[PDB]
Amino acid sequence: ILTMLVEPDAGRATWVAASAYGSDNTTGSEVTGALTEIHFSTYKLAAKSFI
Amino acid sequence: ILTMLVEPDAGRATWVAASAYGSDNTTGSEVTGALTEIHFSTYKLAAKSFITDETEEDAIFSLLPLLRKRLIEAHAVSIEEAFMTGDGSGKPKGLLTLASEDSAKVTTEAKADGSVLVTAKTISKLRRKLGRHGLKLSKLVLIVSMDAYYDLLEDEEWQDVAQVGNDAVKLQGQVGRIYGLPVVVSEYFPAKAAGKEFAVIVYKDNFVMPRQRAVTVERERQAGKQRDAYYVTQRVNLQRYFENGVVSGAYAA
Amino acid sequence: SAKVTTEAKADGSVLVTAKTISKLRRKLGRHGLKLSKLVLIVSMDAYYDLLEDEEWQDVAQVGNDAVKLQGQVGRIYGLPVVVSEYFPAKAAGKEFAVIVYKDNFVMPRQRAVTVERERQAGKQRDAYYVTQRVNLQRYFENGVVSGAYAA
Amino acid sequence: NQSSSVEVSSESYETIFSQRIIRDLQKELVVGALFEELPMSSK
């Protein structure tokens, strides 16, 4: 088996109000992401004869 | 805030009678004028992300560049989405919202289910609502959704070579200029449904981007929890001079 | 779920036309906007039906490459045509064409084609063996659209 | 701003007034001067 990796999608930011210009909400929200993986394999094919 | 002055409208002269040559009425009437003003503002966009100092060791490869790139690309996605169809509550009013609130939302006969496609003639018919600014073609921008483009690719009026020059669809499979308007495809249009926009035409020179500070990255170390917070902020807005210069077409109700 | 059930009948009441083939690009979604990265494959019957297509007959309709002057179909809606004979038999609900995103597919392989010979003196026989190990896989779960005859 | 401990009195010290003057697109004049003159020195 061979395994690869898959990058996640895109996030987004937020628009803060003016009333929170001094508090701890002035940095808005948080963006998060996780990776993913895929797999590969093979099958066997054969044939024979006699003389 | 920033303020500029808008010059007033025009005036009229008078046709004096022939019996008023010997009186002060010979000199005519008065022309008065008063200036006005407009203002511009800005809005703040922010995002953050944390990375504890133990997941960095608790893995084989690094995870910081992914974090930073995700931050920046999320910021760009949000700003472009807001410019597309942001409302007015603390965020810039989107182009489609401007067109709708200016009564420039032309309700066409194309159907959202798929019974009737979107024809190039329908797209070109939107130029009427632009009024005086629609006469010039070098000063316009056309943007269509993905599904509008795919329905354009199957237009009965662009198939034959004899119908449309050398740019027939059958020979190319691609659509370039529609009625002289270059075609640009964007996927950030709203969901396809009844009464939803699928193409917009804007007067490019009428819109500006007020901006206070660019995208800035700040790094804070929170030793009390052993993390590495990152902060990204910017202040922008989308503003226009006058109350015209956009038209949007929508599916039928 | 990319099997598009088109209107072409499985007997011959309705033929397979160029519009049916070109309409499949929509179900490719974002991948369908670039023609240079696609491959079209049609069966025997599909190709013979295309040869009788009504919209490729005249010089006025389609340039100089009208069917009446050449008798074969080359580029169709910008897509080059490849004919393959291994499609299933013409029947209701079966397929006749496919478009694939070429770069989305890989062919993993462990060993090449190898031949080994064995001598069985007890039977006066020579046994020949040919073996190989391959497979067909894709990166992400999309990029393929197939059209099928009507039910 | 009115968020810090020290702020300014009135908005006029938070605003930039510009003398730049702008006008919209105006109508054009066509039949005003397309005919030919006829000078009269009498009534």
Residue numbers in the entry:
A (entry chain F): 205 to 255
B (entry chain E): 205 to 457
C (entry chain F): 307 to 457
D (entry chain D): 162 to 204
Please, what does the article write about this entry?
Furthermore, we could separate the particle population into pre-ejection (capsid filled with DNA) and post-ejection (empty capsid after DNA release) states and to reconstruct the related states of the portal complex and the tail tip individually at resolutions sufficient to build atomic models of each state, gaining insight into the conformational changes leading to DNA release. Following a similar methodology as for the intact phages (representing the pre-ejection state), we obtained reconstructions of the different parts of these empty phages (corresponding to the post-ejection state). Consistent with structures of the closely related T5 phage, the T = 13 icosahedral capsid of mature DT57C was composed of two proteins, the major capsid protein (MCP) and the head decorating protein (DCP), and it had a diameter of 930 nm. The asymmetric unit comprises 13 copies of the MCP lacking the Δ-domain (the first 160 N-terminal residues, which is cleaved during the maturation process of the capsid). To further confirm that empty phages indeed correspond to a post-ejection state where both the DNA and the bulk of the TMP had been properly ejected through the tail, we compared tomograms of virions in three different states: empty virions with an intact capsid, filled virions with an intact capsid and empty virions with a broken capsid. The tomograms revealed that nearly all empty virions have an intact capsid.
The T5 family of viruses are tailed bacteriophages characterized by a long non-contractile tail. The bacteriophage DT57C is closely related to the paradigmal T5 phage, though it recognizes a different receptor (BtuB) and features highly divergent lateral tail fibers (LTF). We present a composite map determined by electron cryo-microscopy (cryo-EM) at resolutions ranging between 2.9 Å to 4.9 Å of the entire T5-like phage particle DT57C, and atomic models comprising its core structural proteins. Our results provide a complete atomic structure of a T5-like phage, provide insights into the process of DNA ejection as well as a structural basis for the design of engineered phages and future mechanistic studies.
